[PDB]
Every structure is written in C-alpha cells, then in structure tokens.
C-alpha cells in the first residue's frame, strides 16, 4: 500500500518520484534524510523509516535508496517485492544502476513507473514482457499480459533450439573458532537460458530423493533438497501432485528452480590457520589449507581471505603455492590460487610488523572467507535426468546444462 | 560396441570375484551425456549379456549389481537406476521396461538367495509395472 514511490540519491536529492495514491505530501521526503542520519548515528537505522504517521520503507540500491512512502497499514512484504521487481527491471533495461541513467533515461523511466503500478497496486513486472509495450527508442499491449502466460511471449522463432542450463552450487560453511562447523548449508541453483522457437512446455526431471522413493527407486544417489522453490513458470499444483516439474521456459536466462538442503559432509577445503601475534612486536600466520574435495576436481580461482591486522605494515608472506597479497583497502591477506587440484595442501607462513603504540579501540576478528570455485563438481550429487521439451509444431530440442561448484557463505570464525 | 565387449569380461571377472553375500566427491566426465537407460538400450544390453554369458545364473548380490551398474554407466552414460528389481519374496521383475534380466529364488525376501535369469518376456510384458502400478506412475 505504498503512497508514492521515489528514488533518492547519496546527497539526499530525490532523483525521481512517482506518487501512487497521493495521500502523503511530497514534502515528507525531506525529513527522510535527517531521520536516516539520526538512525544511522544512533544504531536505530532501518530500511523501514517512519515520519510520524507516514512510514518510509525502502532499501538501499547501488547509488540511491528506493524509498516508498506509505501511511496506512500497507503490506511491507508487498512493498519490498515491488522494490525488488523495480530494481530487476531497471537492471534489465539499464546495464548500470547509478545517477548517470536516472537523469538520462527519465523519458522511459517515467513511463515504466506509470505502467508498472497503478494506485499502489503493481500489475506487470516482467522485463521481457514490459519491453514490448514501453521502449526508450507505442503499439497495443501484448496479449501475454492479458493471457495467463505472462512470462513467455508467443510467436518467438529461432534458427536453432538450444537451451543452456547452469547447475550452480553454493557451498556455505559456518565454522566456529573452535574448529567445528555450525551452519553448513548448500543451496542449489538451476538457472537456464532457454532459447527455442514457440512456447515449449519444459518437463524438468531429476533424480530427486522424493521422486525416486515415489517411483520405487529410493536406493540410488538421490538429491534430498529440504526446500525447493520453483519459478513462476513452474506449476505449483503439478509439483505438489506427483513431483511433476512442468512449466513453460521463458525467453532468456531465468531461475527455474532453487534447491536448498543441508550438508552433512566434510568441508571440501580444510583451513588450519594460527595467529602468532606478538604483543606489539610481530605476528605469525601459520595458515595451512587442506583440500578435502575429490582429486579429479580443480578449484579454479581459489581466494581464501585471511583477515590480517588493520595497522599491520611491512608484511612478509612465506607460502607454498599461489600468490598471496595484502590489500590495504580490505585489510586482509588475499590467498589467491589460480588452480587448486583436489587433495592439494598449501602451507603459508605470514610475518608482518606492528606499531609500538597500541590502537585506541578494538577492531574485532573478521571471519576467514574462502572463494573456492570448482566447476564440473556436484557436491550434492544431484544429476539432471530428463527435460521434456514439447512443442505443438514439433521440433528436436538440444538442451544443455553445466554443473558449477563454488563457495557461498563459507566463512571461518577466527580465534 | 568394442568398448562394451572389452569391459564385459573384466566386469564378469569382477562380479565373480566378489562374494555373493575411500574417495569423496561426484566427478562427472566433461561432455559425457547422462540419461536414464532406454527400453531398447536395456533390451540390447540384456541380449549382449545373454550371448556373452556370466550374467544368467550368477548369484545376485548387492556389490555385483552395483559394480555392473557402475560399469554400464561408465561405458554408456546410463544412470544406475534402471537396474532395479521388484520387491520379494519370490521372483523379482526388472523395474525398467525392456530389461531381460530378472531375479529368481535359488533355494524374509532379503535373506532369500536370488540369481539372475534371462527372460525375453520382460522386454514385451511390463511385469514390474503391472505388479506395482503406483511405482510406474
């Protein structure tokens, strides 16, 4: 129930505003900046502000905060979803989200803002569908919005029918300073770039544990996804009935399904780091990385971030494999490794100075984060079984998919 | 299939060596297609096994079946899920249509001794599907 959607800037100037109900005066945006400054300076700053009887719930973008004023008991979740959809639409239309396009793409921005939401109730959010009715360089609105299928424009024709899939893995590990892993969750991501002719009805089929149990094959390697979130094209009823993943793929790259299940296996990389920090004299970093992953897999672009002292200067690194550099902007040791074969063991011996004068205030212990990304490795063991591409005209599809394993929330708590 | 013929003797020897009763990860061959075994492919594999021998009359074991499924997946890219048998006690029919292999008693279904027996009627009659319509959907 947003009253006026406005786009602010880093200096407090509203780049663009679009009132939806008009029940809130446009002058309330001026008090948002002082209120945000007071909240940030007192630790009470939150994305949902409140100027008396008017609430300013908005998120911070790359360069400006998309603040949407509201006065009644509007749905905060609905406002957040609308803001996320607007951000996605802006990213799809404009390659950059900065003030350079706000003051240059106002002609199409105003039209998009007017068409997207009316009276505070959004109606269209598909960038691909919206690109056929509002352009910055107008015909009747497409029937896709009026029809049930609002995410697949009819009449799409291509020379070839190739669909590229991406089974991206997110290895998130929360290892405490005692050496035990607390939060170890792996979230699957099935992102597909469907490029076919017509409006095919994809029938996704994988070796799901539930599907195998229902079919009676609950004895082989089956993926046990605790949470499975299908896209808008995926029919919820079909999945709820008999685990049938039937949906119309969109034209382009989109997230069809996103599995999310816990992981009870050992970490693919084991980091043994020590801190021999002398009292204002020197420091030692006996960091040893052990790869627990399969030897057939190589972790391309391994970046184990080791937080070094903030005031440390004149550091020396005695490592074994990979380039180690200290970035003063981040104040940490970047253990950058290009290719890390599975089972490899890298040992490092850091040595940096420390000023005699102690710091005025404590700086904390940032967690050690690894940036391992090993492609062609499915840690969860989930493999795509089939993809039923059916078209009324009739064509031979050539679906493709790749498995990518990377490190997600793989942070290591410091001692 | 020269590769299949070469792997058949080694697979049979490994199955015979294993009695009837270390590396982590799931590596995937780059560009190797992976899909469930087809009915025609299953029938061809059953015919090849019957012609070459070593599978008909062999004592059914979990280790031998797993080794055979792994070898089939390595040599053909077929998922090791179509080599499923119907629950006992008694004769277990193949779960995948087209398979000519079945398990029959040789003497709780788990402790019953079962051996692989060729059955050409499996590729034409869906015995497993008829017995378990719910499992076939």
């Amino acid at each position: 129930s947003a009253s006026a959607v406005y786009v602010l800037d880093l200096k407090g100037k509203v780049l663009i505003c679009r009132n939806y109900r008009g029940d809130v005066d446009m002058s309330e945006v001026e008090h948002f900046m002082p209120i945000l400054m007071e909240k940030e300076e007192e630790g009470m700053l939150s994305p949902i502000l409140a100027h008396g009887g008017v609430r300013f719930m908005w998120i911070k973008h790359n360069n400006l905060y998309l603040v949407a004023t509201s006065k009644k008991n509007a749905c905060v979740s609905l406002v957040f979803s609308f803001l996320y959809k607007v951000v996605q639409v802006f990213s799809e239309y404009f390659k950059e989200l900065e003030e350079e396009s706000i003051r240059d793409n106002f002609v199409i921005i105003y039209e998009l803002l007017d068409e997207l939401m009316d009276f505070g109730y959004p109606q269209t959010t598909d960038s691909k569908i919206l690109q056929e009715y509002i352009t910055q360089e107008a015909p009747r609105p497409p029937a896709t919005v009026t029809n049930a299928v609002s995410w697949r424009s009819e009449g799409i024709k291509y020379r070839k029918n190739e669909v590229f899939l991406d089974v991206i893995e997110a290895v998130n590990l929360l290892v405490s300073a005692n050496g035990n892993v607390l939060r170890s969750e792996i979230v699957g991501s099935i992102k597909m770039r469907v490029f076919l002719s017509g409006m095919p009805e994809l029938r996704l089929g994988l070796n799901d544990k539930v599907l195998f149990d229902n079919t009676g094959r609950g004895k082989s390697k089956s993926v046990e996804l605790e949470d499975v979130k299908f896209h808008q094209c995926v029919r919820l009823s079909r999945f709820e009935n008999d685990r049938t993943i039937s949906f119309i793929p969109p034209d382009g790259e989109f997230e069809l399904m996103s599995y999310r299940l816990n992981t009870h296996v050992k970490p693919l990389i084991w980091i043994e780091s020590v801190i021999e920090k002398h009292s204002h004299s020197r420091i030692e970093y006996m960091v040893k990385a052990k790869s627990q992953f399969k030897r057939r897999s190589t972790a391309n672009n391994v970046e184990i971030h080791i937080p070094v002292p903030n005031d440390a200067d004149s550091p020396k690194f005695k490592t074994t494999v990979g380039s180690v550099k200290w970035v003063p902007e981040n104040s940490e040791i970047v253990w950058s490794v290009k290719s890390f074969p599975g089972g490899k063991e890298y040992l490092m011996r850091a040595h940096f100075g420390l000023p005699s004068v102690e710091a005025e205030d404590k700086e904390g212990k940032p967690p050690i984060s690894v940036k391992f990304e090993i492609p062609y490795f499915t840690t969860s063991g989930i493999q795509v079984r089939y993809l039923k591409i059916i078209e009324k005209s009739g064509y031979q599809a050539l679906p493709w998919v790749r498995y990518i394993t990377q490190n997600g929330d793989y942070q290591l708590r410091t001692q | 299939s020269k590769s299949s013929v070469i792997g058949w003797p080694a697979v049979r020897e490994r199955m015979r060596r294993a009695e009837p009763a270390e590396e982590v990860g799931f590596p995937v061959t780059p560009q190797v297609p992976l899909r469930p075994m087809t009915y025609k492919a299953a029938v061809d594999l059953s015919h090849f096994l019957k012609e070459k021998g070593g599978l008909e009359g062999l004592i059914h074991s979990q280790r031998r079946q797993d080794i055979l499924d792994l070898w089939i997946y390595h040599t053909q890219g077929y998922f090791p899920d179509w080599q499923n048998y119907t629950p006992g006690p008694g004769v277990r029919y193949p779960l995948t249509f087209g398979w000519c292999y079945k398990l029959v008693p040789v003497e709780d279904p788990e402790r019953e001794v079962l051996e692989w027996r060729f059955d050409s009627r499996l590729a034409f009659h869906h015995v497993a599907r008829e017995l378990h319509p719910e499992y076939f959907k």
Partner: peptide
C-alpha cells in the same frame, strides 16, 4: 570450453521409468 564446467546435454525424461 567454458570456466565452471563444460556444458553437457540433458535427456528428455526418465526412460527407465516409462
């Protein structure tokens, strides 16, 4: 080639499940 694992062709359905 492509970083992050080479793309592999996908099947049409569970051929072993009819």
């Amino acid at each position: 080639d492509r970083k992050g694992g080479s793309y592999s062709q996908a099947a049409g359905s569970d051929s072993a499940q009819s």
